[PDB]
Amino acid sequence: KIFKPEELRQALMPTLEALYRQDPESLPFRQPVDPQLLGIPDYFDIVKNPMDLSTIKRKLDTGQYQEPWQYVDDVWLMFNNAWLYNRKTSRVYKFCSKLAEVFEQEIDPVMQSLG
Numbered sequence: 001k002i003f004k005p006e007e008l009r010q011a012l013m014p015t016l017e018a019l020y021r022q023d024p025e026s027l028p029f030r031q032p033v034d035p036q037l038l039g040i041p042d043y044f045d046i047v048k049n050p051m052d053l054s055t056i057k058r059k060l061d062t063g064q065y066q067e068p069w070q071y072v073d074d075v076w077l078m079f080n081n082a083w084l085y086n087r088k089t090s091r092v093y094k095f096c097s098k099l100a101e102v103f104e105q106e107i108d109p110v111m112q113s114l115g
């Protein structure tokens with residue numbers, strides 16, 4: 001199966017929008033982590049492949065996904081980075097877990113629809 005750019009965008013953008021609609025839980029994930037500004041300069045020692053919502057949105061808007069699983073992989077890279085870097089008691093970790101619950105719920109019927 002070949003997926004057209006607008007087909008991926010129409011099917012997947014609502015799932016991304018469901019993540020942005022979570023407050024406060026989307027807030028840590030809206031822009032790329034800036035370790036110096038945020039006071040966490042060890043971040044890139046630990047997270048080798050950063051990912052965030054703004055990057056995923058741009059990739060969806062600019063045809064950088066050819067297959068829905070490439071989009072799913074980037075969302076999960078964002079989640080796995082947050083569970084790797086952050087302590088289990090932290091806001092970012094718990095907010096990541098909430099986003100992963102929302103995403104699992106939204107993405108399943110969409111994958112079924114895409115075939």
Ligand SMILES: Cn1cc(-c2cc3c(cc2C(F)F)N(c2ccc4sc(=O)n(C)c4c2)CCC3)cn1
Nearest residue numbers: 024027028029033038040081082085086091092095
């Ligand atoms: C009202 N409210 C605001 C926040 C919030 C907002 C941002 C961060 C973190 C938090 C909070 F949850 F701490 N920001 C952040 C800081 C440290 C790390 S470490 C990591 O992996 N990430 C993704 C981040 C992100 C990025 C800038 C926005 C949560 N509620």
